[PDB]
Design a binder for these strands. Structure first.
Ligand SMILES: [Mg+2]
Ligand SMILES: [Mg+2]
Ligand SMILES: [Mg+2]
Ligand SMILES: [Mg+2]
Ligand SMILES: [Mg+2]
Ligand SMILES: [Mg+2]
Ligand SMILES: [Mg+2]
Ligand SMILES: [Mg+2]
Lengths: 141, 38, 131, 92, 136
RNA sequence: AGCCAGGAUGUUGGCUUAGAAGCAGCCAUCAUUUAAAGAAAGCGUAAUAGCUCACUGGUCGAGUCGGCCUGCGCGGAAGA
């Protein structure tokens, strides 16, 4: 395994193929072209779900293309369809925006365990619960 | 430099020095913050 | 840093772990990565839980104040960075080798894997353990 | 919350200022059927004492000529602008 | 600009600003700007130092103004000889003896209450100091 | 005092989709892995990135800070 060659990530909802206004220049800032992030990018977008931001590693080399392995979508963007309100934070303590219980977030926590790193399920459970705490969702424990 | 009668520490890297009787404020980051007197 | 009591608590906590322990293993991440941090300590979760305190504070008088009371041979290990990974369940567990095995699995270095104290030995990779 | 204090002999404008410009300041103890007692005491102690909020509530035992008298601070005169006491009234 | 709404007499004597102040204790608010020095504060200075506090602490917090002018100051026009009447009232002042609490704050942090009073003190002529509401 | 030293994956997180994205404007001010890390004190960005400050830290080796009370001095301080 190599050190920091360069590979910085940054992309939008995976369904939106070939993003020029959102990402654009940063996508093909290096010697890697713009067109590859459309054919190869939607190779693993179509398996799980579209209209969902999912991160992928961009380890560029001097050949032409790059090697890559994906991970897992973020906490809050998952907590819109899962939470209910498209909005999240805004004015949490001044005005509690929403609420989620432990039973949902504990169940949603373990599905990311391929990417997520921790000791027990209950360890990551309170973290992935925790990610709700600051979307105005004081966890209903 | 400035020759103001109330020199003071503007940024974090600014440093107060008494050279030859006169109080100066020499700096590393911004050469602007270099200032004499007072 | 906090009061003499707060630091005495941390060492006196470490001394009680040696009383109910046996095998230990060094580890030095001169160029560490927080992805590696969740492998050798993830292991501790796979063993059982939180109790396995790695306690990386081998300062010449900090963790070596507890040395005089428990296992005097560890004073010479003090030089260079070292972490006294104290074990609990299973006499001579598999936690010793995993530091040496992880060192190959993207961790740069690991204190030259010198080891701690069961037969009072030095740098030896030992697969011969109870399993 | 225990302070040693001397008994006053000269008392007025002239004495009190001489005293107040000697790291000390005048106070008085009074209460009950007994007569009042004028009490000279050190400044640098009582200045550090008043920072605690207990000083203006709890009972203080002032040591005078051996005898420890129990009192509470009833009134107090601050110096107009400088952070320092001028006088304290101890109720018994 | 602060000024008395109507008065008995338009013009007042000069007088003498002697003795010590009376509003020494920090009465209403938590903190206060005490006048160490002696002098007189114009109506403009008070407003100028109020604006400097108010804008430093933002909308949050509450401010008191313990001093109020109620003393008219006359001034003679340019190129006018002596006598031929007392001059015309130009501005209004508050006489400040040592010890007088000028301003008092409430509902703010101690570290950020000081920074506000420095900015006020910068506007005033009199040498000032910070004071806290003690007990008794 | 120094000083090879750590100071995270999702946070493009919500919300005015022109991005606000630890540091412009709306509060939260997560909890994990833990030797530690505020979802952040400042710099830097069209925003990121990237430097850091609190701090776990590895050493050296015991005195160090930040205010009061202040008696003498210092600058501010240019004319025929
Ligand atoms: Mg010279
Ligand atoms: Mg008169
Ligand atoms: Mg008066
Ligand atoms: Mg009165
Ligand atoms: Mg006329
Ligand atoms: Mg000092
Ligand atoms: Mg002087
Ligand atoms: Mg000149």
């Amino acid at each position: 395994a190599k050190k920091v060659q360069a590979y910085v990530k940054l992309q939008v909802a995976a369904g939106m193929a070939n993003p020029s206004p959102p990402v654009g220049p940063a996508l093909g800032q290096q010697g890697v072209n713009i067109m590859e992030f459309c054919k190869a990018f939607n190779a693993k977008t179509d398996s799980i779900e579209k209209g969902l931001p999912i991160p992928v590693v961009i380890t560029v080399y001097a050949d032409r293309s790059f090697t890559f392995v994906t991970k897992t979508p973020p906490a809050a963007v998952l907590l819109k369809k899962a939470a209910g309100i498209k909005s999240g934070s805004g004015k949490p303590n001044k005005d509690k925006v929403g609420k989620i219980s432990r039973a949902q977030l504990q169940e949603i926590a373990q599905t990311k365990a391929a990417d997520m790193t921790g000791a027990d399920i209950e360890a990551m459970t309170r973290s992935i619960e925790g990610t709700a705490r600051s979307m105005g969702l004081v966890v209903e424990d | 430099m400035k020759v103001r009668a109330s020199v003071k520490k503007l940024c974090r890297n600014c440093k107060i020095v008494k050279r030859d009787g006169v109080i100066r404020v020499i700096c590393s980051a911004e050469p602007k913050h270099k200032q004499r007197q007072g | 840093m906090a009061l003499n009591l707060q630091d005495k608590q941390a060492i006196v906590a470490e001394v009680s772990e040696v009383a109910k322990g046996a095998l230990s293993a060094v580890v030095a991440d001169s160029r560490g990565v927080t992805v590696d941090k969740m492998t050798e300590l993830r292991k501790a979760g796979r063993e059982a839980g939180v109790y396995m305190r790695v306690v990386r504070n081998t300062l010449l008088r900090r963790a070596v104040e507890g040395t005089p009371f428990e296992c005097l041979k560890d004073a010479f290990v003090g030089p260079t960075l070292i972490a006294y990974s104290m074990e609990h369940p299973g006499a001579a567990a598999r936690l010793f080798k995993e530091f040496a095995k992880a060192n190959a699995k993207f961790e740069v270095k690991a204190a030259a894997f010198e080891g701690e104290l069961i037969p009072a030995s030095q740098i030896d990779r030992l697969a011969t353990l109870p399993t | 919350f225990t302070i040693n204090a001397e008994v006053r002999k000269e008392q007025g404008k002239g004495a009190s200022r001489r005293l107040r410009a000697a790291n000390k300041f005048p106070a008085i103890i009074y209460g009950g059927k007994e007569a009042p007692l004028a009490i000279e005491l050190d400044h640098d102690k009582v200045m550090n004492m008043q920072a605690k909020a207990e000083f203006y509530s709890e009972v203080l035992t002032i040591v005078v000529d051996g005898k420890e008298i129990k009192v509470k601070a009833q009134d107090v005169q601050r110096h107009p602008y400088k952070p320092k006491l001028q006088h304290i009234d101890f109720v018994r | 600009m602060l000024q008395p709404k109507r008065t008995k007499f338009r013009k007042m004597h000069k007088g003498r600003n002697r003795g010590l102040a009376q509003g020494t204790d920090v009465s209403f608010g938590s903190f206060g700007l005490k006048a160490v020095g002696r002098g007189r504060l114009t109506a403009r200075q008070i407003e100028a130092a109020r604006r400097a506090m108010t804008r430093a602490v933002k909308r949050q917090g509450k401010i008191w103004i313990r001093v109020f002018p109620d003393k008219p100051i006359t001034e003679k026009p340019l190129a006018v000889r002596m006598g031929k009447g007392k001059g015309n009232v130009e501005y209004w002042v508050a006489l400040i003896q040592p010890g007088k609490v000028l301003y008092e704050m409430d509902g703010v942090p101690e570290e950020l209450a000081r920074e506000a009073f420095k900015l006020a003190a910068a506007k005033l002529p009199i040498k000032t100091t910070f004071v806290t509401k003690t007990v008794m």
